[PDB]
Amino acid sequence: DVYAQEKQDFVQHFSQIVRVLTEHPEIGDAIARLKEVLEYNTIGGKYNRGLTVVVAFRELVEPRKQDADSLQRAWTVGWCVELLQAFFLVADDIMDSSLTRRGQICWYQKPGVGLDAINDANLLEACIYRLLKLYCREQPYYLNLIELFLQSSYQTEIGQTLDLLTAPQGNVDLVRFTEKRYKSIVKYKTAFYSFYLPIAAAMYMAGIDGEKEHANAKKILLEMGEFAQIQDDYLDLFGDPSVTGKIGTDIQDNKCSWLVVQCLQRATPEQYQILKENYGQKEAEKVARVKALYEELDLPAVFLQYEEDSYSHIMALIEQYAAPLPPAVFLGLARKIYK
Amino acid sequence: DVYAQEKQDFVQHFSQIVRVLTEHPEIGDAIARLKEVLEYNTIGGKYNRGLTVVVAFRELVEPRKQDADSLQRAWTVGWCVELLQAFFLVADDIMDSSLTRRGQICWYQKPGVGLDAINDANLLEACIYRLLKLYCREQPYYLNLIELFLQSSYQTEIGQTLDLLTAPQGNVDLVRFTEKRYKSIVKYKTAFYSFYLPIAAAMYMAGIDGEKEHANAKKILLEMGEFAQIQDDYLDLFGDPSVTGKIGTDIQDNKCSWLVVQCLQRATPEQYQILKENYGQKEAEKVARVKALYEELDLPAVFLQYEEDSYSHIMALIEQYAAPLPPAVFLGLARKIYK
Ligand SMILES: C=C(C)CCOP(=O)(O)OP(=O)(O)O
Ligand SMILES: C=C(C)CCOP(=O)(O)OP(=O)(O)O
Ligand SMILES: NCCC(O)(P(=O)(O)O)P(=O)(O)O
Ligand SMILES: NCCC(O)(P(=O)(O)O)P(=O)(O)O
Ligand SMILES: [Mg+2]
Ligand SMILES: [Mg+2]
Ligand SMILES: [Mg+2]
Ligand SMILES: [Mg+2]
Ligand SMILES: [Mg+2]
Ligand SMILES: [Mg+2]
Numbered sequence: 001d002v003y004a005q006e007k008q009d010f011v012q013h014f015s016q017i018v019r020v021l022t023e024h025p026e027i028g029d030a031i032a033r034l035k036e037v038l039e040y041n042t043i044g045g046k047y048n049r050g051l052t053v054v055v056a057f058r059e060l061v062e063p064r065k066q067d068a069d070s071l072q073r074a075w076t077v078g079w080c081v082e083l084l085q086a087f088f089l090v091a092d093d094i095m096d097s098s099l100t101r102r103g104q105i106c107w108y109q110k111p112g113v114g115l116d117a118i119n120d121a122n123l124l125e126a127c128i129y130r131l132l133k134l135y136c137r138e139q140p141y142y143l144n145l146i147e148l149f150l151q152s153s154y155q156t157e158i159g160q161t162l163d164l165l166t167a168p169q170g171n172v173d174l175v176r177f178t179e180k181r182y183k184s185i186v187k188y189k190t191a192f193y194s195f196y197l198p199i200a201a202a203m204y205m206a207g208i209d210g211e212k213e214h215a216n217a218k219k220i221l222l223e224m225g226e227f228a229q230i231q232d233d234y235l236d237l238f239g240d241p242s243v244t245g246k247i248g249t250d251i252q253d254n255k256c257s258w259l260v261v262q263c264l265q266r267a268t269p270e271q272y273q274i275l276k277e278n279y280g281q282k283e284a285e286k287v288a289r290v291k292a293l294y295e296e297l298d299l300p301a302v303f304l305q306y307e308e309d310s311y312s313h314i315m316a317l318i319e320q321y322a323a324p325l326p327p328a329v330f331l332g333l334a335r336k337i338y339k
Numbered sequence: 340d341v342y343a344q345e346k347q348d349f350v351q352h353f354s355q356i357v358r359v360l361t362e363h364p365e366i367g368d369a370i371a372r373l374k375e376v377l378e379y380n381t382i383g384g385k386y387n388r389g390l391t392v393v394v395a396f397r398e399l400v401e402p403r404k405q406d407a408d409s410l411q412r413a414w415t416v417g418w419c420v421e422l423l424q425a426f427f428l429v430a431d432d433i434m435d436s437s438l439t440r441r442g443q444i445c446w447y448q449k450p451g452v453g454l455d456a457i458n459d460a461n462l463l464e465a466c467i468y469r470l471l472k473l474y475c476r477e478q479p480y481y482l483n484l485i486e487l488f489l490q491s492s493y494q495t496e497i498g499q500t501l502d503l504l505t506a507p508q509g510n511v512d513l514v515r516f517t518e519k520r521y522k523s524i525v526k527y528k529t530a531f532y533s534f535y536l537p538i539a540a541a542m543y544m545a546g547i548d549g550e551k552e553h554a555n556a557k558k559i560l561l562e563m564g565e566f567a568q569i570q571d572d573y574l575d576l577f578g579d580p581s582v583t584g585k586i587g588t589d590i591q592d593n594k595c596s597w598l599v600v601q602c603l604q605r606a607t608p609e610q611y612q613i614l615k616e617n618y619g620q621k622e623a624e625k626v627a628r629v630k631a632l633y634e635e636l637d638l639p640a641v642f643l644q645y646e647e648d649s650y651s652h653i654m655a656l657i658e659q660y661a662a663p664l665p666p667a668v669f670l671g672l673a674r675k676i677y678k
Contacts, residue, residue, distance in 0.1 A: 026523040030500035091461070095454050112507070115434050118457055119499045122430070126493040133486070143482055147472070154465040160458045161369035168451070184365040 002332050003051040010051055013075045014043065020134060021127055037107075037120045038127070041086040042079070044102035044245070048336050049085055049198045053078035056202035059329050076135045077145065077201050080128045084149065084193060087128075088156060090121035095164065096249055103245040125153070141204040148200055152193045159189025166256040172276055177256045177264055183226065185256055190232075191225025199329065208325075216321040220330050223317055227310045228337050233258040234303045237291055251287045254280030259299055266297050311338050341671050342390040349390055352414045353382065359473060360466055376446075376459045377466070380425040381418070383441035383584070387675050388424055388537045392417035395541035398668050415474045416484065416540050419467045423488065423532060426467075427495060429460035434503065435588055442584040464492070480543040487539055491532045498528025505595040511615055516595045516603055522565065524595055529571075530564025538668065547664075555660040559669050562656055566649045567676050572597040573642045576630055590626045593619030598638055605636050650677050 022035045057074040058066065092098075093106040094117060100106060108117035128149055136142045162185045166176045196218055203214065236248035237259060250257040263275060274293055278286040294300075311334075318330045361374045396413040397405065431437075432445040433456060439445060447456035467488055475481045501524045505515045535557055542553065575587035576598060589596040602614060613632055617625040633639075650673075657669045 026519075027497055027501060027527065029504050030497050030527075033500050033504060034497075091457050095457055097454075114508075115436075116503045118430050118434055118460075119496060119503060121457075122461075122492070123496045123500065126489070126496050129489040130493060146485060150465070150468040153461070154469060157458060157462045157465050158366055158369050158373075161372050161462065162366060164455045164458060165368050165372060169453075180365075188366065188369075 001335075002055050002328075003048070003336065006051055006054060007047065010047055010054060010075060010078060011043075013079065017076065017079050017131070021130060033120075034123055034127075037123060038083075038086075041090055041107055041120075041124065042082050044104065045082070045085070046336075047078075047082060048333075049194060050078035050082040052198035052333055052336075053081055053201050053205075055332060056199050056329050057205055059326050060202055060206035060208065073135050073139065074202075074205065076131055077205060078198075080131050080149065081193075081198050081201065083124050083128050083131075084152065084197070087121050087124040088160075088193070090117055090124065092160065094118070095160070096253055098249055099247050100241070101246050139205075141207070141209070144204040144209060145201060148197060148204065152197045155188050155192040156190075159185060159187070159192075163189050163255070167254045167280075169254065169280070171254070172280065173254055173256075174260075174264060174272070174276055174279065177260050179261055179265075182256055182258065182261050186226055186229035187222055190229045191222045194228060195221035195225040195333070199333075213325070217325065219321045220314065220317050224314055224330075224333065224337060227307075227314065230258040230303075230306065230310070231337070234300075237294070238300055238303075251279060251290045252282050258303075259294055262299050262302055263294060263297060266302075267293075271297070307338065340674075341394050341667075342387070342675065345390055345393060346386065349386055349393060349414060349417060350382075352418065356415065356418050356470070360469060372459075373462055373466075376462060377422075377425075380429055380446055380459075380463065381421050383443065384421070384424070385675075386417075386421060387672075388533060389417035389421040391537035391672055391675075392420055392540050392544075394671060395538050395668050396544055398665050399541055399545035399547065412474050412478065413541075413544065415470055416544060417537075419470050419488065420532075420537050420540065422463050422467050422470075423491065423536070426460050426463040427499075427532070429456055429463065431499065433457070434499070435592055437588055438586050439580070440585050478544075480546070480548070483543040483548060484540060487536060487543065491536045494527050494531040495529075498524060498526070498531075502528050502594070506593045506619075508593065508619070510593070511619065512593055512595075513599075513603060513611070513615055513618065516599050518600055518604075521595055521597065521600050525565055525568035526561055529568045530561045533567060534560035534564040534672070538672075552664070556664065558660045559653065559656050563653055563669075563672065563676060566646075566653065569597040569642075569645065569649070570676070573639075576633070577639055577642075590618060590629045591621050597642075598633055601638050601641055602633060602636060605641075606632075610636070646677065 018035055018038055021038065022031055054074050057071075057077075061070070089101060090107050093101055094108045094115075098106050099109060107113055107120065108115070113120070129146065132142070132145055132149070136145060162181075166173060166181060166185065199217055199221055200214060203209070203217065208214075233250060233255075235244050236250045236257065239248070241247055249255075250259075260275070260279065264272070267275060271293060274289060278289040278293075281287070314334060318327055318334070322330055357374055357377055360377065361370055393413050396410075396416075400409070428440060429446050432440055433447045433454075437445050438448060446452055446459065447454070452459070468485065471481070471484055471488070475484060501520075505512060505520060505524065538556055538560055539553060542548070542556065547553075572589060572594075574583050575589045575596065578587070580586055588594075589598075599614070599618065603611070606614060610632060613628060617628040617632075620626070653673060657666055657673070661669055
């Protein structure tokens with residue numbers, strides 16, 4: 001629990017991030033709206049990505065080099081990752097027609113916001129580079145960070161494209177829901193920005209810029225990302241919204257979920273037809289019918305066994321590729337992800 | 340007409356831009372969608388911003404330094420500006436609830452596209468930095484260009500925020516439609532990316548990176564941007580869609596248009612009430628009523644006089660601040676904008 005006490009210290013730095021980003025009186029009204037956007041969307045999460053930057057920074061840099069300004073740049077780059085997340089989620093909730101996020105109504109669903117949330121999400125993305133310029137402009141890793149935040153956006157956007165193309169509204173897409181398709185979607189849409197980006201940001205900030213070390217870390221982190229998305233898909237249906245903070249839509253949205261991939265792999269010809277007639281539709285009785293089929297195929301028990309096989313697999317990859325990084329960097333993140 | 344012959348040469352370079360951006364078989368389907376997005380949204384315009392990069396590059400660099408690779412980087416940076424435009428317009432058409440753009444139906448209005456256009460617009464933005472990396476990575480102006488494309492996005496997004504905040508759907512906002520408000524909106528939402536960004540990109544590519552020269556060029560270019568937006572607002576209502584390629588929505592969208600600012604400045608107490616009761620609403624009879632009031636206040640004649648006063652003003656600013664740049668750089672763009 002290296003991030004447990006570090007959680008409140010990280011959140012305490014948000015007020016300054018806002019003050020700096022909310023510092024030309026003509027654009028006053030727009031700046032007031034940006035503060036309102038930041039406060040609604042970048043707060044309320046677990047901050048696992050933002051904290052990973054800070055915790056990984058501390059574990060990779062010698063304390064004699066961890067000065068007040070150096071640490072300030074670490075929390076700031078941590079909050080840049082949280083703004084990247086906030087950008088993706090504001091937009092993903094519109095495209096996934098979501099209702100709630102982190103225990104409250106979706107920013108676009110708020111009266112008086114609507115489709116203006118599209119520009120609001122883009123302002124969240126713009127703020128990353130605004131922060132990187134304000135704090136990392138003179139640093140030798142400045143361009144490496146910008147290129148890493150830009151590349152992470154492209155990877156995710158390419159992943160979202162795959163996600164939306166495999167899930168067309170109104171079209172039976174069971175033929176597309178394969179294991180190979182699934183692994184490509186989750187690698188691009190989640191695994192790069194959620195696991196590779198926070199550790200790589202800390203690595204570049206610690207002067208670790210070698211291609212081999214970044215490739216070795218990536219081998220561990222992308223496999224961890226694959227599990228986090230399988231867990232996210234499992235919780236979309238079998239998770240408690242009081243804990244998850246959001247309401248699942250994967251069945252209604254005809255999404256290439258891990259569960260439907262597992263359903264199709266185990267379904268009898270009769271069970272496939274029930275799935276065909278009820279998947280990808282808005283009717284509650286159809287969604288209920290799909291959830292009834294999943295429970296009949298013991299997919300929650302199939303997920304339990306997967307979590308164990310996956311945990312053992314990621315641990316074998318940490319033993320294989322962690323060096324010369326402290327294994328604590330990868331274990332702390334494994335601890336946050338597995339329960 | 341320094342861009343007239345240069346138009347077809349610029350468009351001929353698009354096929355390679357697509358081939359390079361559409362060059363991991365797993366993401367094949369997403370890459371096919373990106374090509375479809377590029378071909379629908381980055382083609383059909385006048386390409387004035389993209390051509391300005393190329394024409395300004397030619398006029399600022401000595402021909403002995405204008406090699407095949409150097410020129411290739413110029414057309415590519417020109418197409419980066421066209422992709423920035425395509426990103427903003429795909430998103431602006433959703434938020435402005437537009438029907439057509441460049442003679443065809445809006446990408447989001449297309450059956451099977453919808454709100455997925457949000458991710459499509461973000462992929463267009465991602466492509467800029469993908470291109471800048473592929474062609475300008477080794478150049479000394481690489482970071483200056485990235486920072487200029489990022490800063491231009493923020494400026495525009497801050498401008499769009501002002502634009503949407505001044506135009507709330509369902510609220511009478513005539514008190515907000517002032518000359519001071521108007522000049523702030525158009526400076527941020529249009530003037531920076533449409534006029535400063537193409538010339539500044541060429542300036543950095545020509546090794547002109549001095550703050551004073553960039554400030555002097557900005558003085559001319561932002562004032563030119565203010566006129567281009569006044570002309571855009573005028574054409575929203577009094578322009579021919581066969582020429583403009585789009586259908587005006589400013590009255591229905593309760594936008595802080597130059598015309599409504601001019602209406603309010605000249606309206607009798609009785610005329611103000613007709614505007615109050617009919618502006619910002621979707622009913623055709625209400626929009627017709629507003630257009631009838633504008634024509635009664637001779638706003639098309641008021642625009643004619645403004646275009647002349649503005650032309651004389653921008654020409655005085657070129658005489659004042661053009662040096663040491665060739666005046667041809669600013670005159671060619673003035674020629675494209677004024678008619
Ligand atoms: C990409 C994933 C699977 C979904 C959201 O991530 P988080 O679970 O980290 O959400 P927040 O804590 O930031 O709200
Ligand atoms: C920002 C302005 C005022 C609107 C669109 O610009 P253009 O008139 O340049 O549009 P395209 O030629 O690119 O279609
Ligand atoms: N990966 C971003 C958002 C998600 O994880 P979320 O379940 O909406 O939070 P998705 O399932 O849409 O991929
Ligand atoms: N500036 C971007 C788009 C516009 O010019 P357009 O008239 O929609 O092309 P707006 O009037 O919305 O500002
Ligand atoms: Mg989602
Ligand atoms: Mg999604
Ligand atoms: Mg999910
Ligand atoms: Mg518009
Ligand atoms: Mg607009
Ligand atoms: Mg307009």
